[PDB]
Symmetry: D3
Amino acid sequence: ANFQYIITEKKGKNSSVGLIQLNRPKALNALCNGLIEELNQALETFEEDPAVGAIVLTGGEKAFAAGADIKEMQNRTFQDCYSGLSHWDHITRIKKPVIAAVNGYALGGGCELAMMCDIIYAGEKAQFGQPEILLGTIPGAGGTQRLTRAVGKSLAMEMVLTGDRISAQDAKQAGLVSKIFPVETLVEEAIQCAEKIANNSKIIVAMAKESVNAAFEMTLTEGNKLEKKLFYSTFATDDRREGMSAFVEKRKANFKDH
Amino acid sequence: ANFQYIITEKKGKNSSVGLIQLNRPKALNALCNGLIEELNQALETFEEDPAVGAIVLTGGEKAFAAGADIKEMQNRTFQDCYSGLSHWDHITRIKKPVIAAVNGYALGGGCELAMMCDIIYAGEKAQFGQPEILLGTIPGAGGTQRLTRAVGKSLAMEMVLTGDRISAQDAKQAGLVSKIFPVETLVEEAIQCAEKIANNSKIIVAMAKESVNAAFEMTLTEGNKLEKKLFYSTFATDDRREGMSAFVEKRKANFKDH
Amino acid sequence: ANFQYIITEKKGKNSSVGLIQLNRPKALNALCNGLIEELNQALETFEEDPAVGAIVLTGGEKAFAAGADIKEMQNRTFQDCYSGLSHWDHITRIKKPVIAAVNGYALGGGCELAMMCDIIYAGEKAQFGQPEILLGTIPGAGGTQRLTRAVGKSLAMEMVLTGDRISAQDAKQAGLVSKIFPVETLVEEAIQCAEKIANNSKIIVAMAKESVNAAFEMTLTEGNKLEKKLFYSTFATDDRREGMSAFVEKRKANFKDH
Amino acid sequence: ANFQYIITEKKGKNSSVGLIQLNRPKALNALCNGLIEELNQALETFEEDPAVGAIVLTGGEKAFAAGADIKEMQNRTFQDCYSGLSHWDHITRIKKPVIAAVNGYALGGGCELAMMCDIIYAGEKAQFGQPEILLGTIPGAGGTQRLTRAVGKSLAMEMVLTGDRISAQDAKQAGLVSKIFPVETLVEEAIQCAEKIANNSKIIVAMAKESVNAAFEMTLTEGNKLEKKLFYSTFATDDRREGMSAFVEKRKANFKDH
Amino acid sequence: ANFQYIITEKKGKNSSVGLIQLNRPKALNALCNGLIEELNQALETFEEDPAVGAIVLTGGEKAFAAGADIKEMQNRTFQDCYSGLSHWDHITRIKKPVIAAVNGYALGGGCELAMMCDIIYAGEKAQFGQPEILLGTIPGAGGTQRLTRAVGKSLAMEMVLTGDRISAQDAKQAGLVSKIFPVETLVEEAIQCAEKIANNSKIIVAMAKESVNAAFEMTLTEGNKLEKKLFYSTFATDDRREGMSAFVEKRKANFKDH
Amino acid sequence: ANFQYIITEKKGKNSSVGLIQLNRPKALNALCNGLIEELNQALETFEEDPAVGAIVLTGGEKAFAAGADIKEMQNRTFQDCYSGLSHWDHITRIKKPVIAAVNGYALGGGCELAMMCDIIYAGEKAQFGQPEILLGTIPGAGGTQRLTRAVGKSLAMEMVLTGDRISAQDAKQAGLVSKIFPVETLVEEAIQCAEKIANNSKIIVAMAKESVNAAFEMTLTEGNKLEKKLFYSTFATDDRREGMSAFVEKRKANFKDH
Ligand SMILES: CCCCCC(=O)SCCNC(=O)CCNC(=O)[C@H](O)C(C)(C)COP(=O)(O)OP(=O)(O)OC[C@H]1O[C@@H](n2cnc3c(N)ncnc32)[C@H](O)[C@@H]1OP(=O)(O)O
Ligand SMILES: CCCCCC(=O)SCCNC(=O)CCNC(=O)[C@H](O)C(C)(C)COP(=O)(O)OP(=O)(O)OC[C@H]1O[C@@H](n2cnc3c(N)ncnc32)[C@H](O)[C@@H]1OP(=O)(O)O
Ligand SMILES: CCCCCC(=O)SCCNC(=O)CCNC(=O)[C@H](O)C(C)(C)COP(=O)(O)OP(=O)(O)OC[C@H]1O[C@@H](n2cnc3c(N)ncnc32)[C@H](O)[C@@H]1OP(=O)(O)O
Ligand SMILES: CCCCCC(=O)SCCNC(=O)CCNC(=O)[C@H](O)C(C)(C)COP(=O)(O)OP(=O)(O)OC[C@H]1O[C@@H](n2cnc3c(N)ncnc32)[C@H](O)[C@@H]1OP(=O)(O)O
Ligand SMILES: CCCCCC(=O)SCCNC(=O)CCNC(=O)[C@H](O)C(C)(C)COP(=O)(O)OP(=O)(O)OC[C@H]1O[C@@H](n2cnc3c(N)ncnc32)[C@H](O)[C@@H]1OP(=O)(O)O
């Protein structure tokens, strides 16, 4: 469509990386309903596009996304909430992998949106935080849940109770993010990692992703049994036969996505 | 009351931080029943004090606490356990946040009491450990559970099976504690974090704390749903209206704990 | 027996440590059905030897193990999977502690084998990875489950979806391994950790290992209650009464394994 | 809208109950994609109607519904499944209560659809079953999960593994259904149970329905604590003050749904 | 003490049974704060009385208990709940078994109190219900959790969403209660069950009770393992050795509660 | 082999049902190690037999099994249990369905062995119980877990804490067993049900069985998703195509176990 709040581009080898860029820089990309509706639309389009194997989500160089728009919630009631932040986690239902390339601020709903991605790459000056407590509320889209599971009780409690930000280097050391890149090459490096993934078999990559996600939803006993079943499933695909022949016949693999 | 084994003080801005100091230096604050009874009293008194928004728990410079009291345990039988270990985890039922400021030894029951706190700050010479195995027993107040969830299986196995101590630095790197301070300022630094948590609304802070804790008790799916209900609940308070107004109007929020 | 693929030896003080070494260096220790079978036999023999209190598992300098054997798997089918990698987790059923000493490559099934040990020590040049996705399959023995639980979602997703390796240093920082040592002393350092475990009471150590393992199978509430029960159980042993009388009596405990 | 497969109607005191009637009896209400989409829209419409407080779902007199449409499924593949039957559980996302009035056959997808409702009333000649196994497949929409949790392992295994049907009386005795009525008054009796529900506050009913559904997603300890939060949240509503004043003042309650 | 709203007595063979009778019949046993505090005291006194091995909780003939007390809840606010019905589940922490003998009404808080006992015996005219919804609130002490787990989703949803009562016979058929007896001998029949329990070893009974309770708190795999460790623990008591010796020696066991 | 304690035969149409009869009538089939060992061999042999699709497990007319062997357990110690019950749950790892046909007593370990089967059919004079508590021990092979999940808390507590037996009719009413047959035809009836099961595809039957068992190990969300995956799996098989072709061609299906 004609997007007012984001820009999308297809990037990388063979146009296989979908790039979604939040673009509301005077508001440092605060998450408003308008922008969320567009993000959701773009994610669905990329998800349905057969040439796209992975998505990179990024913002501007000073901010991935600072916050939601407070003015937009300022006047709601308990009843309003309860009976009526609904479309905020559509990103968790995409099957293809999604990499957040975070430069600058990722705060509040912004930190949450990044944690919902499968992988996070941070720029050198990135900063993460959940300042919701400073506004008299608490994180409402996994900020108390995905953060704690990544960084441990002590650091998550400190962040959620004080609102204090942490640096890209603290995030990486704690495992909230897995690489740090220079500011000017962040998105390009995220695009390469996405390309590498997109070169894999899509149906296998989707099973792997589902398998890793399952580790937050099951005991280890049941997570292993699920994994084992996804693993048996891969033997029903041509890609599995091809990847393994390629290694025996010492050649490169040619996946076809089934 | 007139405490035999602890000292309590009110501190920080407006006396908003309750300080509790273990004070049985002759036994390196070994946690005998009597001391635990006084601790639980001091915590309840803080909890009920409307001036108090956070608590700091600390020992002396040489030990936070060197464990449960081995002398009191020596002569117990399997059958004493059964029909008889009891008020050891009252601290987990306090709604207000509790920060452990650990200088020196925190071993066995003492490491466990620190890990039950929301946040741990460590002094430069602090040491953590679970030496229970060296007495022919295992950790009995979360030392195999909270430790493992903070530092990973490999280090928690190594600590629990050998009894080896780790440093403050190793504890920080592993996410068991979140900051390290010089010995002589640790307690002051912990009070400053406490005072920051105490400036926020007491009822919102209690909710946020409940939400974070819930990351250890449910799948990520039901944790996100429970957080969302608590987020909705915030919109039932005056302090949520006041915080959101203050952000929009760009002024200091004046929270009144409801 | 007469082993083709591994070498076993008894080591440490009084020969209390069973060492198992994978020995199929022309395939970089690839884990074929034959070798898994021997490995399982060697594990059962050490578990049954009353002289052995802990096991070290290791490979060569260049590789701990490069994976399941891709040539045996090549012509498997979805129905073969279903109706017939079955003894692949026998190691998780050994009650005595097992430490992986990983030099060089630990990839795919080899990374998984290491992650199933209680403790991992890594050599300076070690590398961990899950390159299954490059063959059109996913990790099938815990590599989406135990990895995620040790290193966090972001790093696990990146490793499983790209197949990229991580260094020993990255692995320690993320808590997948708990110590790093020079290539040449690695095994010796692992035998020392093992010998220390072996000096402790075998019954309490088996309990303490169970308890730590429970942290991935239950909520924190229930894990604490199971631990408490096993902690009560220790009071049924001679070793528990000795270990604590020793401390009180200012003398060396002498453990009898009961 | 112009519905092919279902009929809808408002019923009961003040048009408070929305009635959805599946209406493809030349195929015994076999649930083809077409019918599901229609079903799903009707559910949404009643969900958004501020006059309706409960929905009654029902089929014809001889079949509630005899499964998904075996002819639509005949030629699908394993890769079709993976990459491409999907809106089957929209009903689980409706917040208002939904009662299944089941006359005649409710088999396979049909039995699943009824088990996804909150309440099931059965006509005297109703029959429930999961005959998937007779087609070479297994239940795919909760038939091995919701059935087993309602009837116990022995009866579920017998049903799933043989395909045998059970009677309305066996279903009530086992707790899969909760009342039995004559074939010819079943719908009207469901409607009167729905109107009783619709007389209660709509926000409170939604909270209660969520509490009860959480019994299948959490341990009891966590389900109690979630329940407790929803219970406290009711005190933020006018409806609660109103129901409770009306008891005290011995008068009827007048609820406003907030 | 000198009780205002309850009566206690010791009954059974050798006065081995503590009987607690709720006694506020002019409010049908509405559970005000005051009565809750005396119940809790009486429970604690039987728990510590070494002559008592099991407790029987009953009410009057027309009512066991009609609920929490609506006049004391009437003016509470959301902030009251929050930063404030707290000692309501002390009965769940008593180690000795508690049997509810329910004659007459057990509604709302009163149904919940009975579901918190280990065993419920119902008189012929008893009725069970959760009418909270009719007051614009939801059950707040396990009514949506313990009821659903006993009777299945359909019947719990119907009860919680309509407020309708069910009979003693429906409750027994659904497994909410496990015996029905005549109104006039109900309490003596419950005493008989408690005396039988009290003749058994207290320590093994307590462990059996904990093992049954674990069935609502973990997966079947882990509850089997918890149970196995409790079963090994029994072999530390004299009573277990006595119990089996007596079977093999063809004589009566004499238990000694250890 | 030459079994001392059991008898096996193949039965039903096409000899498709493996019948294992416990045959140690002078001890009422008390389950000593020797008998468990033979039991497990007989089950493995039927598991591996491509003509067998289901197994019927039975005892004699007077006792299915009266428990673990009290004579063998008498002189065990705490410490024996630690290091040394072990192959007691091999039956739970069989993929083919197992039906217990219980005539007469099934008590203690014998009630537990029946509950470990997928389906229980009971003779008219069968009796179920957990009399462990009368020997000073608790159930140790699922008696506090599988029982409670089948019959609800109240009846399970009453059985486990008193040792009282329940009839066949009480068991069927509570959902512990799914059908009652006359004593002299019970085995023939169970074999007929096994024969139906064995008419279906063995690979689809095994997946159906694994799905149903999953209901005890996962929240409903994750149980539904695992089931979905299994459902997709079936589309990789020939039997799924054949069964669904057969309905539509209105002929009888010809399954080939793949
Ligand atoms: C449910 C919870 C269960 C918890 C279970 C547990 O925590 S089991 C407990 C686990 N923790 C312990 O095993 C650590 C035990 N303590 C030590 O190992 C050591 O004290 C230490 C390395 C920390 C410090 O050695 P030092 O030589 O500096 O100090 P020293 O040992 O002389 O201690 C000073 C005095 O405190 C006493 N003391 C120290 N630790 C104690 C303890 N846990 N229980 C009782 N008393 C203790 C001593 O015995 C000595 O008293 P006297 O010389 O005057 O007698
Ligand atoms: C349930 C579990 C499922 C597990 C599934 C898995 O683990 S799937 C497995 C995942 N792991 C594998 O993908 C890693 C494959 N291996 C490699 O990429 C590479 O070998 C390497 C990166 C380790 C290093 O390569 P190098 O070039 O240094 O060494 P090179 O490739 O010459 O390998 C040395 C010899 O070992 C053999 N070999 C190496 N890895 C093997 C493996 N995993 N399975 C079988 N055979 C293997 C190769 O064929 C060459 O054998 P010949 O020259 O005699 O033929
Ligand atoms: C993800 C979710 C997955 C769900 C997957 C599933 O539910 S698998 C589906 C499971 N359910 C099915 O097995 C039930 C199949 N139905 C039956 O076995 C039988 O129809 C019956 C026992 C229900 C009733 O038999 P009767 O003899 O009275 O009626 P009869 O067999 O003639 O059926 C009446 C008409 O309905 C059609 N029909 C009935 N059930 C159907 C189904 N599931 N798919 C499509 N068509 C069906 C038939 O083809 C016939 O139409 P025509 O004569 O015009 O052709
Ligand atoms: C955390 C936990 C939360 C728990 C929350 C709850 O249990 S909420 C509460 C839920 N339970 C209630 O909704 C049930 C309320 N009660 C009723 O519906 C009805 O009393 C009844 C069907 C039980 C019986 O009706 P009867 O007509 O036979 O008796 P009747 O209504 O005249 O009342 C007898 C006297 O008892 C008092 N009474 C009855 N139930 C009460 C209650 N739950 N709390 C306060 N007082 C109660 C009434 O005021 C009247 O006193 P006066 O003569 O002085 O006026
Ligand atoms: C991990 C799993 C742990 C499991 C733990 C358990 O199952 S503990 C086990 C729990 N189950 C038991 O408590 C039930 C024990 N048995 C009884 O209560 C009773 O035998 C009975 C009520 C079923 C039937 O009484 P009757 O008098 O008809 O029959 P009787 O008692 O004479 O049994 C006939 C013969 O078999 C023997 N016998 C019966 N049950 C036995 C058992 N569980 N272990 C060993 N031997 C047993 C008797 O000792 C007797 O042999 P001799 O006369 O030669 O002596």
